[PDB]
Amino acid sequence: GLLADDEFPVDEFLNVNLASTSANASSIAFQVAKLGSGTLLDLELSALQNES
Amino acid sequence: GLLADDEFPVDEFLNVNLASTSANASSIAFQVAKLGSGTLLDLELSALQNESKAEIISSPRLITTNKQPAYIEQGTEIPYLESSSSGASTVAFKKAVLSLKVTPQITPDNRLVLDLSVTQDRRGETVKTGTGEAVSIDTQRIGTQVLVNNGETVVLGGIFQHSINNSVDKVPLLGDLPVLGALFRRTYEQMGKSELLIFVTPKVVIQ
Amino acid sequence: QITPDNRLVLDLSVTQDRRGETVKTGTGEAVSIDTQRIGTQVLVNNGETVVL
Amino acid sequence: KAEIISSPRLITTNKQPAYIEQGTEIPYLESSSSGASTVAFKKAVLSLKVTP
């Protein structure tokens, strides 16, 4: 109950934040959310490969 | 009950505040909060480690007649604001090119004497000049006279660089304990290395 | 220039430039140019190619 | 702590001047002749200049 503003700290949530930084990168993301025992875990992969 | 504004003093709360200051640093944080007896304790670790490599090669060529000057270029021409003669401005162009400029000479015992200029410049940042701005240039240049056998290579010059940095900030006595000390200190370490080389090789066209 | 033994001496300039970005000059702006240039004197047989 | 090392090299002919450079050229606002401005470039380079 300690912090005042509570919608979701999307940036304070993440442990490892090393996303592929581009405009055409493709991703996919998996989740496990209980909310009864509290546990939540998220995992997203992203990639890109081009040629010219 | 003494202070008026109470949501949480997140900055006055922390005892030791030595977080890894970067944009790609990864962390993890543990907590023990009772709120019945009042006790609260927080501990967060953060880290980062990266690494990089690069390599560039460029090679221009020319053919020419003995004792005759030749050049080949590729780059940009930057318009600069004014050139001054007796009274007014002929605004001119500076070059930022990868260029080769040469005059050769053939000698009797199968050898060449070369008068050499080789450059590789680029367009840099835009600095502030007076109330205005202008564009700066990043350069690499070598100019020489050398004497080289007919069909082999020589290295004209090069530049080598190396650098190492270390830093620590800690708590005066605790940040030195054998295994626990890592809880009381921030550590930073960086290393760089660079190397540049220039080669040349002439050849007489035997028809 | 044509020589006796079926050969040419050429004084050559060949360029290919384009219009580049618009850089900042003083309180104003101007247009920059992207260049490729080669200038030489060569000696070549009558009807064949050489790389300059 | 800190430590930096830099070493340029050259080869040249006896009694003949040679140089090698690496750095930037700063455009400065104006150079003055009899009347007007030829804005010029100052150098900020790591350079070696030698006559043996």
Numbering used by the authors:
A (entry chain K): 365 to 416
B (entry chain G): 365 to 571
C (entry chain K): 469 to 520
D (entry chain F): 417 to 468
Give the text the authors published on this PDB structure.
The V. cholerae T4aP secretin PilQ is a member of the bacterial secretin superfamily. Bacterial secretins are united by a common C-terminal secretin domain, which oligomerizes to form a large pore in the outer membrane. During natural transformation, the T4aP extends and retracts a filament to take up DNA cargo. The T4aP machinery extends and retracts the T4aP through the PilQ outer membrane pore.
Here, we present the structure of the V. cholerae T4aP secretin PilQ to ~2.7 Å using a fully functional, His-tagged allele that we express and purify from the native bacterium. The cryoEM structure (C14 symmetry, overall resolution of 2.7 Å at Fourier shell correlation (FSC) of 0.143, and 3 Å at FSC of 0.5) reached sufficient, isotropic resolution to recognize and model residues 160–571 of VcPilQ, which includes the N0, N3, and secretin domains. Once assembled, VcPilQ forms a 56-strand beta barrel. Inside the barrel, two further beta hairpins (beta strand-turn-beta strand each) form a gate. In VcPilQ, a 32 Å alpha helix follows the N0 domain. Following the end of this helix, the protein chain changes direction (~104° angle) as the coil flows into the N3 domain. This dramatically reduces the channel diameter, from 90 Å at the bottom of the N0 domain to 60 Å across the N3 domain. The inner beta lip, N3, and coil regions of VcPilQ are all negatively charged. In our VcPilQ atomic model, the distances between the bottom of the AHL to the top of the beta strands is about 3 nm, which is substantially taller than the same region in the previously published T2SS structures. In our VcPilQ structure, the inner channel distance between the corresponding glycine (G439) alpha carbons is about 8 nm.
